[PDB]
Design a binder for these strands. Structure first.
Lengths: 106, 48, 49, 170, 197
RNA sequence: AAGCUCGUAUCAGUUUUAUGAAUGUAAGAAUGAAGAGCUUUUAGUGGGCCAUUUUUGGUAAGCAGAACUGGCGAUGCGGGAUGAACCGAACGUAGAGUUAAGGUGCCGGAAUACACGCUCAUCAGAUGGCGCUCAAGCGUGUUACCUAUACUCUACCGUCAGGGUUGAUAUGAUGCCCUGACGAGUAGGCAGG
RNA sequence: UUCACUGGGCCAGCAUCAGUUUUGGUGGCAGGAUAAAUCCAUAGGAAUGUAGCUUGCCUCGGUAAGUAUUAUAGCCUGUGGGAAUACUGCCAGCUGGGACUGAGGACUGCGACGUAAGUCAAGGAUGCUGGCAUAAUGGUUAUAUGCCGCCCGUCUUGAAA
């Protein structure tokens, strides 16, 4: 009734970067309740969606979606590397990103 | 003849890493360079 | 022939080591006659010699 | 981490010199190659040789006899410093010979700034009978029925936000 | 995991807390620190009193009125310790700080709402037993802030109004504990326990 | 640049043995290199500083001079908060992976990791800032992670080298191909547009 | 004119594959003191001395002086036996999860599998499926966001100047 949620919700942290150079292709995603790389291994290859309202109505909906994939883990915290088709806008550093359960290993 | 026929191998950087924080010391004192005798097999297999 | 040769080679090293400790002697192992040298440092700031 | 190695050398036998004296000593090292390297450094201090003049006859590991029994290790150590070198004796209550020398190297680094190259391990020996324990802090645990608490326990939270306000009892 | 995450300074460490509160913002995580005044630092008092005044003598030359504005109020004292780790210039920042709200004490409309603590920033979980450590409160007082009193009093009042509450509540959950305790054992129950509940 | 002999045993900033007062000559010594020598002529070039290792001259010190090998010069890139002299790394265009040096409280990508001890400082300490005290400091060990134009693999561009291709090739043989290696650049040279 | 079959791009999803790589689960071995231990025995010993016994004392059985080699707990050392299990190393062992790439273009070749006929993971990706013309998609300009970027040229000197 309340929950229609078939996705794990995680925040979009940053781009893959050094101190002075950032690659905007690979985005870093924190996922909720994920503490280690070992827990993150489950989420590898799962499809991601960044869902947001837009001003103009495109296809009978004021809402647009950018799709992408988890590629690999990033450090010991369960932060995860993620490549989308069109890269995420960088305005979205700290915005909710929906990580789905397809394709399933389980 | 057999060694010279073989082209000098082109190895990648090791899969695990070099182990040590700093590479340019002798292996005997926590480095990478010099003789390592048996551990070369562990190193080259990661570099393969 | 080579598979059998390598097997019998390492087994004779094992057996010689076992026979030394049994007889109370010390078996010197064969001097290593082949090395594999891997370059570790780059092209630059290297002395001529 | 360390391991104990038994190394023997005899300065390669020449004509009219058949089978020399064979100098035996026990070396603590992380691996086999370091043990060999340290052995040559000790031979050159005790007498006049070189690495080319001699040969490593046999290098074998020495496993500890009873790694389920708590022992009292009285260790003699010679070590280099900013000033001239000087002898030392310390006491370590530990399980194995290998764990004892390990904690010694950490303690020597902590209190004297002496690295692995500076330190010679002279002789590691057990203390079987009590009252031979010359140090206070080792004798400290040798009292009958020692019962002490570990108060103010630091409990590691994996999450960044706790909701209880942690009460560190034990 | 919760739109807002009201924190309670009471028994924390400016720096650590801060820091962790920082990260939480730059990652879109609204926050609201309270009881600010009853925050904590490290090292005797006379310390923080210096490692500050120095921050006081600051001021600009020609025009002292356009330089480092030395805020006394704790909330602020701490808000700085924070804006110090947050580009607080590039929009990405402004966007943050814009996600904060450090209050001295605990004013509505939070009073009535749960809070928490950052277990990785507690005097009692980082500072080696018995060891000097400030308490902002005094520190602020000693250098201006003219209200430690108001909050003080105007505080105790809050604790009352509540404490009283709790009771009513505690006295409530005393029933439940029974309601189930009794309604327990039955069947439907048993089962659950099996599965775990 | 071209012509001539050769494509070799022609050599090498290297090691070894041999034979004398770090250092001379040889090897039926190793290792690498098919890139050598003989003409003939033709541009550009006459800047130092720093650091290293041997000394020589020196009193409060610093250093002064000589020789030797590098670094910058003609040179980007990762790191050292920032930088002529430090650390790593010599660059076609990309994709993926792995690392160096340096780091993982936050600004800042990455362990508020694990383990042993030590340190309270009235401006500790390691400081670029905030800040830190069973540390985010000191000493040490163990792993995990972060990332450069570096290495590995693949594609692509071009250059060079070796080669195939006709009783003619389902495209101009000054075509169509096959294989491998290479790619910084000032003065200057050659070449295609 | 009756009909039946069929649609060519572009971007995707899945399937079996191929080249590169990442991260797991699992099995068989070979080394060492043929691991050492533990454990099953055996013979000694001391204790941070257990049961018992002896003596000064309330607080009910007490608490240190002994006794004693283990008794109504055990430990240590030696001796003998019996398997393991870590650790190091190997497997031309098995089974997965993820990313990137698909270059080339009739057939020749090296092979494997099959009695043969053939077939195949063997000299570089094929097969199926969906999204379309008021499409699908792709681009330009304007600014925003993250990161980066000393003012060009000439002339000096060791480069900054």
């Amino acid at each position: 009734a309340e929950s229609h949620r078939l996705y794990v919700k995680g925040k979009h942290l940053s781009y893959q970067r050094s101190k002075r150079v950032n690659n905007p292709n690979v985005s870093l995603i924190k996922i909720e309740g994920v503490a280690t790389p070992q827990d993150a291994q489950f989420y590898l290859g799962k499809r991601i969606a960044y869902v947001y309202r837009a001003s103009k109505e495109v296809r009978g909906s004021k809402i647009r979606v950018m799709w992408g994939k988890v590629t690999r883990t990033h450090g010991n915290s369960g932060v995860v590397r993620a490549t989308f088709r069109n890269n995420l806008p960088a305005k979205t550093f700290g915005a909710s990103v929906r990580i789905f359960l397809y394709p399933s290993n389980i | 003849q057999a060694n010279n026929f073989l082209w000098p191998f082109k190895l990648s950087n090791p899969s695990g890493g070099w182990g040590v924080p700093r590479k340019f010391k002798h292996f005997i004192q926590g480095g990478s360079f010099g003789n390592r005798e048996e551990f070369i097999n562990k190193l080259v297999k990661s570099m393969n | 022939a080579y598979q059998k040769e390598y097997e019998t080679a390492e087994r004779n090293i094992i057996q010689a080591k076992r026979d030394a400790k049994a007889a109370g002697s010390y078996y010197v192992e064969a001097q290593h006659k082949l090395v594999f040298v891997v370059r570790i440092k780059g092209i630059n700031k290297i002395p001529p010699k | 981490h360390f391991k104990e190695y038994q190394v023997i050398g005899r300065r390669l036998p020449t004509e009219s010199v058949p089978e020399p004296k064979l100098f035996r000593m026990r070396i603590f090292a992380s691996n086999e190659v370091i043990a060999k390297s340290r052995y040559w450094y000790f031979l050159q201090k005790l007498h006049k040789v070189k690495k080319a003049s001699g040969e490593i006859v046999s290098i074998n590991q020495i496993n500890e006899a009873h790694p389920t029994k708590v022992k009292n290790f009285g260790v003699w150590v010679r070590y280099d410093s900013r000033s001239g070198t000087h002898n030392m004796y310390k006491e370590i209550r530990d399980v194995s010979r290998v764990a004892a020398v390990e904690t010694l190297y950490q303690d020597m680094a902590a209190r004297h700034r002496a690295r692995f190259r500076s330190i010679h391990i002279l002789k590691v020996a057990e203390i079987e009978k009590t009252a031979d324990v010359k140090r206070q802090y080792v004798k400290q645990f040798l009292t009958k029925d020692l019962k002490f608490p570990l108060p103010h326990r630091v409990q590691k939270s994996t999450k960044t936000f706790s909701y209880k306000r942690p009460s560190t009892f034990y | 995991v919760e739109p807002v995450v009201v924190i309670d300074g009471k028994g924390h460490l400016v720096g650590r807390l801060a820091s962790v509160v920082a990260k939480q913002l730059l990652n879109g995580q609204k926050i609201v620190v309270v009881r600010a005044e009853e925050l904590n630092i490290s090292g005797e008092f006379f310390r923080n009193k210096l490692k500050y005044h120095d921050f006081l003598r600051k001021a600009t030359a020609f025009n002292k009125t356009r330089g480092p504005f030395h805020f006394r109020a704790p909330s602020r004292i701490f808000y700085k310790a924070l804006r110090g780790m947050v580009s607080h210039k590039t929009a990405r920042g402004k966007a943050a700080l814009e996600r904060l709200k450090v209050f001295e004490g605990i004013p509505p409309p939070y009073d009535k709402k749960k809070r928490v603590v950052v277990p990785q920033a507690l005097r009692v979980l980082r500072l080696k037993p018995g060891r000097k450590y400030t308490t902002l409160g005094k520190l602020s007082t000693s250098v201006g802030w003219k209200y430690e009193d108001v909050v003080a009093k105007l505080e105790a009042k809050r604790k009352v109004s509540s404490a009283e509450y709790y009771a009513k509540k505690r006295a409530f959950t005393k029933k439940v504990a029974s309601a189930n305790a009794t309604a327990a054992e039955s069947d439907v129950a048993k089962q659950l326990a099996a599965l775990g509940y």
